[PDB]
Amino acid sequence: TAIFSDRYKGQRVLGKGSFGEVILCKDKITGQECAVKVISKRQVKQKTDKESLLREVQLLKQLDHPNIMKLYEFFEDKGYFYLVGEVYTGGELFDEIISRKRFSEVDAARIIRQVLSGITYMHKNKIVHRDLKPENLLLESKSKDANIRIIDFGLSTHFEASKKMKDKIGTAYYIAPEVLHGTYDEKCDVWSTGVILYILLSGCPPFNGANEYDILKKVEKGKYTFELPQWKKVSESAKDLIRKMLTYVPSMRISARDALDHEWIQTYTKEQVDVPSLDNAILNIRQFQGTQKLAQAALLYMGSKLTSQDETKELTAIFHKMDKNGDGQLDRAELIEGYKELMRMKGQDASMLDASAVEHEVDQVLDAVYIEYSEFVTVAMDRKTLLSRERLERAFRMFDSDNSGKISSTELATIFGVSDVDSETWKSVLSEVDKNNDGEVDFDEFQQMLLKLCGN
Ligand SMILES: CC(C)(C)n1nc(Cc2cccc(Cl)c2)c2c(N)ncnc21
Ligand SMILES: [Ca+2]
Structure with a gap:
């Protein structure tokens, strides 16, 4: 019944996201700015019925965590869905990391504590991401103390993933093996974070290849190593957390909650040993x-x-x-x-x-x-x-x-x-x-x- 364009006006295009374009919009009465994802019903298939989507949207609007994007409104017309939520202006986490001169395990731990805090909270509310990747980690504001905000939680449950490469760039690196064969649960988000953490401390994806299918082959076998020169300057507790997060069988894989209590997160996020700059990792993340x-x-x-x-x-x-x-x-x-x-x-x-x-x-x-x-x-x-x-x-x-x-x-x-x-x-x-x-x-x-x- 409520019309999106009667309440909001488009100001400018912010960019392309999963399932659609993101527009900076403004409430025509209160002047409140919002980011709106416009999903075309013709280009994007629904995985669930209308009632299942409405019930998840109602839940998603009530949830609130500092590392999860806030959703405000939802509209639907004959041809589109409009997901209206909070704007974040800090950009993607990795574009910020490559702009700074030094990056250490203390910085990687602060990043991953935030992502895990967000995931733990969404898992308690029975919401899985499935497509967690660095591109879905936005910084709240342009300031250096900006919190991380995970975007698109819960959308993959209701919208089918695109088969076009222009929409799948970089998705094969972070996807959990169990998602490829169809039986998956919230543990697939711990794996994706495990991959992100591996890239933060070395700048190289743990499962790599010369094309998409070669990467998925490495992911599906689940084998990786810490045999790169750059891993010698990284702590053993960081490598331990990665092993627990990249454990192949999801029931043996560590939970998001237990990943927060890990020795690495507890030690490297406290204010009280030596921590050098991972120079080779920054160069590899920039490349x-x-x-x-x-x-x-x-x-x-x-x-x-x-x-x-x-x-x-x-x-x-x-x-x-x-x-x-x-x-x-x-x-x-x-x-x-x-x-x-x-x-x-x-x-x-x-x-x-x-x-x-x-x-x-x-x-x-x-x-x-x-x-x-x-x-x-x-x-x-x-x-x-x-x-x-x-x-x-x-x-x-x-x-x-x-x-x-x-x-x-x-x-x-x-x-x-x-x-x-x-x-x-x-x-x-x-x-x-x-x-x-x-x-x-x-x-x-x-x-x-x-x-x-x-x-x-
Ligand atoms: C893809 C870009 C980086 C342009 N983008 N994507 C989002 C995520 C988003 C934005 C609106 C609705 C949903 Cl469901 C998700 C978003 C946001 N909140 N704030 C600023 N930019 C945003
Ligand atoms: Ca050149």
């Missing part, structure tokens, strides 16, 4: 984060380019039919009607919450441009891809940490492995872009490879 973000940006660039081609042609045909005399020009109200018609057929955009948002977007394009609708189409569609094109170059620049301007063949293999692009498929594309290749590409050659890898 790991750069790689994951470039693979993700490459996949989102290709996805936006295909979506842009579909919408450019659809919008061009809508305006062509609306052109009565055939002079190639239309009025403002016509362009609004046609642009609204694009969202009616292709589905409402997360940034275009209602007619007023569409009218403002049309006005923003008309400020750049009886008007030539082909010029309106070009500008409107280039504005939709702007964020994905700029995010690609920024991620290439961040990955190119030595500012050489190029990435090597070994780095391309790693990037395309995380992106799940077949080895022979990208090597074939490189040869068509630059026939006299020397085992390295610059940004334009890399973007040219991606354009070819999505039919251009």
